[model samples]
Target: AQRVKITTTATPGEIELAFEDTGTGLPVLLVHGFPLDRTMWKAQREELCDEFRVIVPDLRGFGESQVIPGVATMEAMADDLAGLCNHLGLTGKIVLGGLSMGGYVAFAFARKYRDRLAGLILCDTRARPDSPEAKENRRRVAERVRREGPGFIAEEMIPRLCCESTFRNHPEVIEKIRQMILSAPPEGVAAAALGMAERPDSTDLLPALSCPTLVLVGQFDAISPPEEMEAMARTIPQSQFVVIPDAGHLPPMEQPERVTQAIREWLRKVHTEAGHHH
Candidate 1:
């Protein structure tokens, strides 16, 4: 529930990013995806914090952070996270991971701060840039959110975010995700939309990942389906891929136990390689 002020290195803008720092041992910075806040990872934080240091941050314009106007690029967010790590005095290599928009930021961070990462975890996200149609849709959504408010965007994206089965079987998850979108500040949603619209193609960086990397995808995620993510997982030199059944874009919320298990196994491997028995 603590918040820290981080000045992004790229644009020199101030962001009062809200984050949760729990447990001890090595730190893994879990960046939240778009249109939501750090609250999205509530389940993961609860489970993982017991074993590893879980650092979850609500990126600049979302969650409890100070909402900035206009556009804020993923590149800037990557810088903000690095600044945050320094602010927290988390030295040495780090376990960096992100889902969706957070995945874009993860790619940016891996490229920009390769020296700072000990491993990588990407969940329910793609390394490719937005297609022209998707980019256009993002801009339109950004405009609509600014005009209509965050609730409007929330209603529109709930189906896209949650799978059909989840919508029917898991009412609680749907309600939770709905509340996340509804409570999000409209200004932040617009800013993040524009940022996502302009994000770069990270596919080229896939092969460059030298550290142990894990790719996780929901089996029913139409946005970034299993095949696309499987191809992505294949590119990385040290990557492992897994599919979460009956989940969608937000696996950490829909199927927290399975996601946590995957991360625990990955973290144990990381600890083992680092000469520690996990």
Candidate 2:
């Protein structure tokens, strides 16, 4: 396992990227959500790396990655992911997965660089653009984040980020998530909030997806509800939808084993079918 830090040429000049690369076999690149870093996928990396080359990256301006000025659009983040793949000399198609804000970037990547993807895993994300009210709220939050820093965002979002059970029973899990949010740079958090508000609607992109796709969400993910994600899965030609029970917005962290099993099974099915010569 290696925690490699390097600079790649992205939309905002030369951008620094930090990623963990481990294990072997088919590569699976996972992106972390907004205001959080690659560490959010810690369990997945530890579990999945045994069978797959797991690559988890801290998006530009988050974690140890270089912080840039102003907004960091999903398109720009998608380009950066492609740049990272090129830097690693990964010419073969890779299975890409993203959560929430990361999912927005995955959609952009799927749209802009279709040929590079073998499959996609979209978890706890929505396809629609922010509503007018939501956009306004994002703007307000971004402004507040710029002034008061990340602690407030951490406090405000935590309750909504996980299910009631996680809050009532898993204080450790909540603390981890709180730390992830608090440690995030305010500039990065604000930039992501602004960028999310500006993101394009990806509803149309779903039905046209060429690769096999897996859509997973927490059973109680209020942010991207299961019903909405189920409808999203139906639109994708080759897709499977799974709901992680007793979890909310952050199922991967809330129920790591279940999420791992879902991804492992889906990957096996997709790769096995692709490997057949007949």
Candidate 3:
């Protein structure tokens, strides 16, 4: 469909962000995961652009986005997204969504700007922070990437992150995901892993979430399993949960149509509820 020219602006120092919007209905800002850029949302964008004002941005130090030293936290990334929304003159309630690492950023944004969001979409993510073992795993991955590089991480992660069915049946799509991971700068990927490892647990805040929330996961997701997603949904009184059958961690890519339909239905429900409340 529709393509808008993407551009970047400096937040502070050389910290740059690239954002593009497809003018439509309510704005939906999408944040992508570690080792991937805004391009990760290509499937969802094509399916939803006709009805939603879709905005996708490359997070700092990923893709074409500029990397500022020491500015890689989820809070910092959330603020950058807020700045982009303000720059676009979007002041009203809007949809905020993210995948994997982007999911963590979306949670941080909700915590900081709850009133500004009409809805929150969390895909392949969890509500709690890393466990002790998980934290060490992240650190080890970061160290390995820093010492060796992204290629090593990419090779190790792709198979574990995607389902066996995906690797065996959809080789092309698997290759694309692999390339996306490999394309990321090593320092950025390492920083992202470390940042996520250190993120504060948001489990307690889930019960306080007021916005309409969508918790989506792949039935076969090994990264953030279905149980984790269910716990998140159970914590949020108004949250809706769905698992894409046979998909892995990246359901948006594995089953884009299903993911897009779920989001569209949730948006409609949220809009109708908002109308009644006002």
Q: Candidate 3 at residue 85, lDDT?
A: 77
Residue 109 lDDT, candidate 2, scale 0-100: 94
lDDT of each: 0.86, 0.87, 0.80
The global Cα lDDT (0 to 1) of model 3 is 0.80
- lDDT of prediction 1: 0.86
- Number of backbone collisions per candidate, in order? 0, 0, 0
Question: Mind sharing the TM-score for model 1?
Answer: 0.95
Please rank every candidate by lDDT, starting with the best: 2, 1, 3
Task: Kindly report which residue stretches of model 2 are placed more than 4 angstroms away from their true locations once superposed.
Answer: 1-9, 272-278
- The residue-by-residue lDDT of candidate 2 on 13-32, one tens digit each, is 56778888887878899999
Pairs in steric clash, model 2 = none
Extract clashing residue pairs from model 3.
Answer: none
- Candidate 1: 10-residue stretch with minimal lDDT: 269-278
Per-residue C-alpha lDDT of model 3 across residues 1-278, encoded as one tens digit per residue: 22222232334622456666775767889899888888788878777887778988888778777655443778777877877777677767778999989988988888898888888899998878889998898888878877787888787788777888788878888888888888887777777788888888988888988888889999999989998789778988788999998789998887778888988888778754354246
**What root-mean-square deviation over C-alphas does model 1 reach?**
2.0
